[PDB]
Write a protein that binds this ligand. Structure first.
Ligand SMILES: *[C@@H]1O[C@H](CO)[C@@H](O[C@@H]2O[C@H](CO)[C@@H](O[C@@H]3O[C@H](CO)[C@@H](O)[C@H](O)[C@@H]3O)[C@H](O)[C@H]2NC(C)=O)[C@H](O)[C@H]1NC(C)=O
Ligand SMILES: *[C@@H]1O[C@H](CO)[C@@H](O)[C@H](O)[C@H]1NC(C)=O
Ligand SMILES: *[C@@H]1O[C@H](CO)[C@@H](O)[C@H](O)[C@H]1NC(C)=O
Lengths: 200, 143
């Protein structure tokens, strides 16, 4: 059996995944088995239960038992059929704190009088290390040339916007996450949430 | 919190230490940091004490590792560690036993029973969890 190809450990939305491509030899209804390294001070390849014999070309590698996201670790995949097992193919190391890719927040909007508050929230993997997330809110009139950007704000705090009573136009908000460990990582801006402003 | 530059310099040192470990034996007879070590398992009053003990051990091991080959890359990291240790000591106000006593005992014994390679590998791989997780829990209940 031809081993999986282009075996890659990557991060998306705060999580980690292993992906790959089928072996050079291209039999069918072949399955795949996946494993990961545990912590460097108690290392052992462990299998990912849910990916065992998968026919998919990826595997979630987040919040695994005995995983240590504070150090490098690799995943490995092999191709398997009844008629053979391929050799293992390892990924590069992935070092979560320095390579995780943040998702945009989901903004929660409340309004009181002339103050509109836009508050970031996130669905975070339960094992995630406590990252310092901040976010940057963009605000604008639908179709307008320029946008306004509010000061970068810590997860935990809302962004406060003063409304103009008479501006009953369709407006729009969006935000991205800034995650800075040793170098700033920016997520994309979230999909705009839009609404008709009305003060009284 | 720790600035991007402090964190970049820790990473450079952590990677250089990990490299040097590929070329020695660093088996440990017992885990230097107990496998379940986690300040969130301790009472708020106990957390600074645990944090201090791992910090002092970390400093002592990395200083002994800081030979002519590594002294340049370890200089910022040691300076930062000293400063964290001093800030922490300034805030530490001074019959069955629990996890805190057991863990301090394991830390205290490690330098007596284990090889230098073992102590270096153990503080090296514990370093970013110390800096990002343990330091954070303590800074919640600061006193
Ligand atoms: C804006 O949204 C954020 C969430 O993205 C809110 O911050 C979160 O607020 C909740 C409610 O108080 C906090 O929950 C609790 O956490 C504490 C700390 O462990 C715990 O003792 C309680 O049992 C409860 O689980 C949560 O910690 C906090 N998250 C943060 C700050 O990251 C915030 O309240 C919202 N602001 C608004 C609506 O103005
Ligand atoms: C696939 O892997 C091969 C071998 O390393 C490489 O040459 C090629 O650029 C990769 N392409 C994709 C799409 O992964
Ligand atoms: C991102 O991850 C969280 C936590 O696992 C999940 O609940 C959420 O649905 C994810 N969001 C996206 C855009 O897939």
């Amino acid at each position: 059996l031809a081993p999986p190809q282009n075996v890659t450990l990557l991060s998306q939305n705060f999580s980690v995944y292993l992906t790959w491509l089928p072996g050079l030899g291209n039999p069918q209804d072949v399955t795949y088995f996946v494993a990961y390294q545990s912590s460097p001070t108690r290392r052992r390849w462990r299998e990912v239960e849910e990916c065992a014999g998968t026919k998919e070309l990826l595997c979630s590698m987040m919040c695994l038992k005995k995983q240590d996201l504070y150090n490098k670790f690799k995943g490995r995949v092999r191709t398997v059929s009844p008629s053979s097992k391929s050799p293992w193919v390892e990924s590069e190391y992935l070092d979560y704190l320095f390579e995780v890719e943040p998702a945009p927040p989901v903004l929660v909007l409340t309004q009181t009088e002339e103050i509109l508050s836009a508050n970031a929230t996130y669905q975070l993997p339960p094992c995630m290390p406590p990252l310092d997330l901040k976010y940057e809110v963009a605000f604008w009139k639908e179709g307008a040339g320029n946008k306004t950007l509010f000061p970068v704000t810590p997860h935990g705090q809302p962004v406060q916007i003063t409304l103009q009573p008479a501006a009953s136009e369709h407006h729009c908000l969006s935000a991205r996450t800034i995650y800075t460990f040793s170098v700033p990582k920016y997520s994309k801006f979230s999909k705009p949430t839009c609404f008709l402003l009305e003060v009284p | 919190s720790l600035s991007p530059q402090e964190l970049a310099s820790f990473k450079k040192a952590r990677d250089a230490l990990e490299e040097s470990l590929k070329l020695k034996n660093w088996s440990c007879s017992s885990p230097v940091f107990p496998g379940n070590w986690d300040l969130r398992l301790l009472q708020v009053r106990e957390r600074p004490v645990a944090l201090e003990a791992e910090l002092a051990l970390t400093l002592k091991v990395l200083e002994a590792a800081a030979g002519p080959a590594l002294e340049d890359v370890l200089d910022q990291p040691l300076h930062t560690l000293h400063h964290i240790l001093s800030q922490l000591q300034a805030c530490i106000q001074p019959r069955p036993r629990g996890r805190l006593h057991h863990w301090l005992h394991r830390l205290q014994e490690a330098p007596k029973k284990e090889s230098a390679g073992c102590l270096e590998a153990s503080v090296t791989f514990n370093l970013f969890r110390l800096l990002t997780r343990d330091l954070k829990y303590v800074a919640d209940g600061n006193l």
